[PDB]
Amino acid sequence: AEEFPVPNGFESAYREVDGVKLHYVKGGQGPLVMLVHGFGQTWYEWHQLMPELAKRFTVIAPDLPGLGQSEPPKTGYSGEQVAVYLHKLARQFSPDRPFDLVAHDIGIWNTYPMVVKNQADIARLVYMEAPIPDARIYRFPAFTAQGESLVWHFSFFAADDRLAETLIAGKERFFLEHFIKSHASNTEVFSERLLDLYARSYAKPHSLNASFEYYRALNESVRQNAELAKTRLQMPTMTLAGGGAGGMGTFQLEQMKAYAEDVEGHVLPGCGHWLPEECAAPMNRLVIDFLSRGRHHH
Amino acid sequence: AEEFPVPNGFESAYREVDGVKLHYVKGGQGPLVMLVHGFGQTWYEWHQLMPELAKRFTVIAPDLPGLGQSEPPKTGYSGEQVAVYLHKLARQFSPDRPFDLVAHDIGIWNTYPMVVKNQADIARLVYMEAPIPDARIYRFPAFTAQGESLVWHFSFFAADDRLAETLIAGKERFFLEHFIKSHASNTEVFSERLLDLYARSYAKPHSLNASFEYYRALNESVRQNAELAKTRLQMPTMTLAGGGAGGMGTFQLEQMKAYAEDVEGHVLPGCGHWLPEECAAPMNRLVIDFLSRGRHHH
């Protein structure tokens, strides 16, 4: 069985990487592009981009360790540890060419270290809607004059005593709808059915825990990145962010300018955090065009 | 009939104020001192201090509207609204003389407006362990290099859709232990027995909801105080804060200087948020000495 519908022309499959069984959905032909999802979601957030991108590229969308249908990591949930799994998976399919990387939300946390450490393996890079873990995250406010803040969940999810699993268990669908909608500008793009699908996936006890372990490792990821960032990113990079409520706005590009020599950015009006759903068409277009400046299938 | 044991020489009683039945515990003789508890607790947090104060003062410790054994407010949960109930309660027992006030945590939120609007009624004031609601609260961080931050719960509790109530219902005892201990330095005063007592009180469905309504009204309280703070407090005041894990540290006094002409502050080493239990001896001494500078029973 499958947690989410696989698009026509794609296949759902698994590969062992360092003893961890990773799930992914793959299709297309040409140079490889790996698409990495974030919190609350799975490979499926890319399902609208995939068929279009597959016309020019081989496209692989893995489930992060412990999430979707992927086994939990055996090393840990820090960015440097998880990035090893994703880098090695990519290299199984693109051993002889650099590959493209597109990441959203904690997909950024889980890829940055392998990108900065293996730059010859990366052709082009697209990051959307999340900070690279660094000291900037300590500046976000706990509370705002309009109500709940953007990232109070960093503390909720990082808390010990399995605080988040214990409170959210039995209310997974309820919590996820609140979380997604509170970070969206356009809530209409999230049908009750789509929310059902995402909730049933992350509600698996090992996936609910895995979800929060990424946050319990966040401070460690920040410390790792303080050393990694001594090396600038040299590949062509594009950032995307939502310009509406729930989005990162100008933060995304402004941070990336400190990390990357060659970066361009866009802020998408009318969209919040969930770009692939809230801003499917413009996001897809910007990604496809940016990656198509490099060698691809015609 | 009692959620918590009433100290010898005290009485548990009720008084209707503006159509709301408030519970309180009262004893002693001399000038009136009102002690006002905060979130996660009830009048009982004061039970060690009460007998000592009762030697020199008439002591009243009410349950905040909706918490402990007090009915919810009929007007609202903003500071100015709740302060009316507490001011009127005190003035029913001290109608012709000023009274002293000691407040902890949201007890501060729920008393500040009546103090500034009725300065002549307040002889001396002790505030401990919480910000007065103002724009400073928007500067606290969502997340720290040492994990969960002090006030991320402001957003959690203030969130729409009854998020906090829905998640915490059925898990109240677990949640309160984590919340209290995460804000404590001397965690071990919170025995399983004591936590059971506090948890069963706030687990009453109307009390769980009431708890969070104070946070849902926080931004309104900030807006109210912006007008009220045009007038500095002129009575002798003392602030206390914990200097250990979970405490407000130097923030308490520094903020209070903006509000009061005559203020002394103390930061208590090895103590977090829960001063009456974590650091009973030094806190009780500081309070007794400070209030005893004024008129009192000998």
Tokens of A160: 């010990």
Burial class (CB in 10 A: 0-12, 13-18, 19+), B118: middle
CA dihedral sign of residues B82, B88, B94, B96: positive
Long-range contacts of the stretch A255-261 (C-beta < 8 A, 24+): A255/A131, A255/A132, A255/A134, A255/A136, A256/A127, A256/A132, A259/A132, A259/A229, A259/A232, A259/A233, A260/A125, A260/A232, A260/A233, A260/A234, A260/A235, A261/A232, A261/A233, A261/A234
Tokens of B123: 């002889």
In whole angstroms, give the CA distance from residue B278 to residue B275. 5
* CA-to-CA dists, residue A98 to A55, A122, A167, A296, angstroms: 19, 5, 43, 12
- Residue A241: Cβ within 10 Å count: 26
Q: Where are the domains of chain A?
A: 9-292
Nearest CA to CA, how far is A174 from chain B (Å)? 9
In whole angstroms, give the CA distance from residue B172 to residue B165. 9
A86 — phi, psi (to 5°)? -75, -40
CA dihedral sign of residues B41, B42, B44, B50: positive
Structural contact between residues A197 and A180, judged by C-beta atoms closer than 8 angstroms: no
Method of structure determination: X-ray
CB-side neighbour CA atoms (13 Å) of B270 = 10
Nearest to A147 among B158, B167, B168 (CB): B158
The backbone region for B33, taken as left when phi is positive above 0, alpha when psi lies in -120 to 50, beta otherwise, is beta
Structural contact between residues B110 and B36, judged by C-beta atoms closer than 8 angstroms: yes
In whole angstroms, give the CA distance from residue B162 to residue B258. 34
Q: Is B21 helix (H, G, I), strand (E, B) or coil?
A: strand
Tokens of B183: 């804000």
The closest of A12, A44, A1, A47 to A202, measured between CA atoms, is: A44
Nearest CA to CA, how far is A285 from chain B (Å)? 34
Chain B residues touching chain A at CB-CB below 8 Å: 135, 137-152, 154-156, 158-161, 163, 166-168, 170-171, 174-175, 178, 182, 218-219, 222
Three-class SS of B82-99: HHHHHHHHHHHHCCCCCE
Q: Do B159 and A145 touch (CB under 8 A)?
A: no
Nearest to B145 among A145, A178, A219 (CB): A219
In whole angstroms, give the CA distance from residue A133 to residue A108. 9
Amino acid, single-letter form, for residue A286 = L
Helix spans in chain A (H): 49-53, 79-93, 106-109, 112-117, 153-158, 163-168, 172-182, 192-202, 205-216, 218-228, 251-259, 275-278, 280-291
Structural contact between residues B273 and B184, judged by C-beta atoms closer than 8 angstroms: yes
* Per CATH, domain B9-292 is 3.20.20.60: no
Structural contact between residues A272 and A246, judged by C-beta atoms closer than 8 angstroms: yes
Q: Which letter does DSSP use for residue B259 in this model?
A: T
Spell out the residues 6+ positions from residue B41 whose beta carbon is closer than 8 angstroms to its own.
B105, B198
Residue located via tokens 């393996």? A121
Residue located via tokens 């897809």? A284
In whole angstroms, give the CA distance from residue A161 to residue B238. 35
In whole angstroms, give the CA distance from residue B83 to residue B89. 10
Element (H, E) at B80: helix B79-93
Q: Is B202 helix (H, G, I), strand (E, B) or coil?
A: helix
What does the longest C-alpha to C-alpha distance in chain B come to? 53
In whole angstroms, give the CA distance from residue B234 to residue B123. 10
In whole angstroms, give the CA distance from residue A242 to residue A233. 23
Spell out the residues 6+ positions from residue A162 whose beta carbon is closer than 8 angstroms to its own.
A209, A212
Chain B partners of A163 at a C-beta cutoff of 8 Å?
A: 175, 178
CA dihedral sign of residues B142, B148, B151, B155: positive
In whole angstroms, give the CA distance from residue B26 to residue B13. 8
In whole angstroms, give the CA distance from residue A15 to residue A13. 7
Element (H, E) at B289: helix B280-291
Q: Do A175 and B167 touch (CB under 8 A)?
A: yes
In whole angstroms, give the CA distance from residue B268 to residue B167. 34
Tokens of B210: 């009431």
Chain A residues touching chain B at CB-CB below 8 Å: 135, 137-152, 154-156, 158-161, 163, 166-168, 170-171, 174-175, 178, 182, 218-219, 222
In whole angstroms, give the CA distance from residue A261 to residue A236. 8
Chain B partners of A174 at a C-beta cutoff of 8 Å?
A: 166-167
Cα-based angle B68, B71, B75 (whole degrees, multiple of 5): 130
Residue located via tokens 């499958």? A2
In whole angstroms, give the CA distance from residue B168 to residue B159. 13
Structural contact between residues A239 and A263, judged by C-beta atoms closer than 8 angstroms: yes
Q: Strand B237-242 and strand B122-128: pairing?
A: parallel
Tokens of B144: 């720290």
Which of B146, B154, B155 is the best mutation test for A, with the most CBs of A within 10 A?
A: B155
In whole angstroms, give the CA distance from residue A103 to residue A290. 14
In whole angstroms, give the CA distance from residue A17 to residue A196. 30
